[PDB]
Amino acid sequence: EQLTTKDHGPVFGPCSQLPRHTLQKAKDELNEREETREEAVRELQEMVQAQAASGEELAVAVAERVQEKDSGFFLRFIRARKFNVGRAYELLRGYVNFRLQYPELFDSLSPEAVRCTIEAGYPGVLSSRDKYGRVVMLFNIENWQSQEITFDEILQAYCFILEKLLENEETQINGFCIIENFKGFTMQQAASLRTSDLRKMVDMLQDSFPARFKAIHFIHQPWYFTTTYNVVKPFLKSKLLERVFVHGDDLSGFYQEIDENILPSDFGGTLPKYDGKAVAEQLF
Numbered sequence: 001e002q003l004t005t006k007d008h009g010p011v012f013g014p015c016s017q018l019p020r021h022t023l024q025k026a027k028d029e030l031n032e033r034e035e036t037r038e039e040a041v042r043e044l045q046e047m048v049q050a051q052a053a054s055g056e057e058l059a060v061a062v063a064e065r066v067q068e069k070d071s072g073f074f075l076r077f078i079r080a081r082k083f084n085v086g087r088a089y090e091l092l093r094g095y096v097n098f099r100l101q102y103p104e105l106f107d108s109l110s111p112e113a114v115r116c117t118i119e120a121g122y123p124g125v126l127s128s129r130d131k132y133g134r135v136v137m138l139f140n141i142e143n144w145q146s147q148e149i150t151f152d153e154i155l156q157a158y159c160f161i162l163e164k165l166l167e168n169e170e171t172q173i174n175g176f177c178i179i180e181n182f183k184g185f186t187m188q189q190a191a192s193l194r195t196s197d198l199r200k201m202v203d204m205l206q207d208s209f210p211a212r213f214k215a216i217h218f219i220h221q222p223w224y225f226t227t228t229y230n231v232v233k234p235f236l237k238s239k240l241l242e243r244v245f246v247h248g249d250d251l252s253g254f255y256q257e258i259d260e261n262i263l264p265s266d267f268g269g270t271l272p273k274y275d276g277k278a279v280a281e282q283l284f
């Protein structure tokens with residue numbers, strides 16, 4: 001506690017320093033500034049290739065994909081698995097595995113086509129971190145039309161925005177936090193949701209990307225959100241479930257976690273209605 005939303009560095013821009021006591025926070029996930037980081041990455045690659053030297057298909061796939069990756073890359077996986085090399089490696093396995101199970105989201109990807117979606121505002125990204133230093137990602141389902149923008153395109157956007165934002169060590173340590181504006185959620189939309197797609201999302205969220213998803217928030221959901229929650233509820237591991245938060249309209253427990261002050265009008269905040277063009281530009 002005793003940490004203001006401001007205390008944390010900029011979203012988007014590669015980190016510059018470790019101040020703002022976040023470095024200590026990481027140390028509290030068993031991090032050591034002194035001798036660990038350097039070796040861990042080594043150990044991982046030593047493990048990556050070792051397990052690929054067995055001839056096993058996956059461990060090999062990994063070895064190929066990561067054959068040309070800076071040390072900061074591998075650190076992303078170390079940081080996310082609490083500095084457990086083994087666990088860290090497993091995240092790398094599942095990480096590659098995801099791309100394999102889901103070709104469409106990474107194969108014909110066009111840097112141009114993606115920008116279109118991100119400018120469209122799906123998803124959104126708060127230009128600011130919450131009081132914890134977490135990238136607050138946004139989605140506003142109101143007026144969404146699945147025929148115009150595919151649930152896939154929206155996920156591909158997530159993937160890009162993750163690959164990018166994860167270049168920032170601050171983000172790596174504070175994690176993410178998603179806001180879900182289900183105010184415009186229609187029954188026509190609820191039934192238009194492929195369970196196959198929902199798993200795709202869930203998968204992204206679980207043991208796929210080297211991120212710390214700390215909280216999912218839902219707001220203004222209809223009385224039938226329970227129907228859609230119960231469909232996904234089986235997929236979510238305990239850790240993630242305990243992090244899903246449905247506030248309804250009583251934000252007297254919501255605004256403590258997320259400061260109304262940094263939120264666009266779209267999500268009950270003071271700021272101007274979310275701008276996709278602004279965000280997208282900073283991306284590229």
Ligand SMILES: CC1=C(/C=C/C(C)=C/C=C\C(C)=C\C=O)C(C)(C)CCC1
Nearest residue numbers: 123139154198201202216228229232244
């Ligand atoms: C309830 C539940 C989910 C379902 C989200 C809804 C049903 C998705 C619909 C629109 C999309 C594209 C929004 C993207 O931000 C998750 C995320 C699987 C896991 C968290 C708990």
